[PDB]
Amino acid sequence: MNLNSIPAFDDNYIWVLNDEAGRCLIVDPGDAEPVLNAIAANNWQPEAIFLTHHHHDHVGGVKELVEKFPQIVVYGPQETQDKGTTQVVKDGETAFVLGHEFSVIATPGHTLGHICYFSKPYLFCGDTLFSGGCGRLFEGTASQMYQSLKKLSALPDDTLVCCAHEYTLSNMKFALSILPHDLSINDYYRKVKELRAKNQITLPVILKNERQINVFLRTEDIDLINVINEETLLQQPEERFAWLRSKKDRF
């Protein structure tokens, strides 16, 4: 099994999983052109598309891909039913692709209907979980995003976080604005900066390591609580999470 990234727009990645026969799965294709080129260049045979949510940079390419490859099954949440989805899926359901069983996980936050797809070790989490960060709350509440990250954090340590955007460096700069003396965050920031100085991709990341350097997965850590509670006297986890996400909104 091979995991490939195809850049699109300014900072999107279209993930492609292909098996040993060249059959492939395409995740969140917002621009069909680079995907079509890679399919041709690599002799891939597209079998399915996964959509995580309805935003344009994630679904814009479906029509052209489906016209070129009429056999493609398009999986997605109810909120993409008008975006070319042919199999609506929801929490707890499974999509069988490339001989692998992908579990569907509802992760409201970025959008209300956002879903994630998991088949060990691959986690396609769209704009919910980023390396060092999480999605901006356009439609979901902070409580919902908090609960969605709790669900993703419970996945196995060897999970590969395949998120949709190259946000890692900015996410880690924010992390240092909150915990500037955390050695793990500093070390990861410097590694991510080194990659981005050479315009290299920072993904996928291993979930085990995200637990250490993603401040949005460290809501219940005493060191973060003490920082957050020195600004606002907040007593509940979802309130502290909202504080941190609001701070990042203006960073």
Q: Judged by CB under 5 A, does residue 55 bind Zn ion?
A: yes
9 is in an annotated binding site: no
We find the least distance from the C-beta atom of residue 30 to Zn ion, in angstroms, to be 8
57 is in an annotated binding site: yes
* Among 50-58, 68-76, 185-193, 223-231, the segment contacting Zn ion (CB under 5 A): 50-58
184 is in an annotated binding site: no
Q: Judged by CB under 5 A, does residue 248 bind Zn ion?
A: no
SS3 readout for 104-140: EEECCCCCCCCEEEEECCEEEEECCEECCEECCCCCC
Q: How many chain residues bind Zn ion (CB under 5 A)?
A: 2
Site for Zn ion in 120-179 (CB under 5 A): 127
Q: Which amino acid is at 64?
A: E
**Contact status, residue 206 vs residue 182, Cβ threshold 8 Å:** no
We find the least distance from the C-beta atom of residue 248 to Zn ion, in angstroms, to be 15
Closest residue to Zn ion, based on beta-carbon distance: 55
We find the least distance from the C-beta atom of residue 26 to Zn ion, in angstroms, to be 16
30/46 with CB nearer Zn ion: 30
Residues at the site binding Zn ion, with contacts judged by CB under 5 A: 55, 127
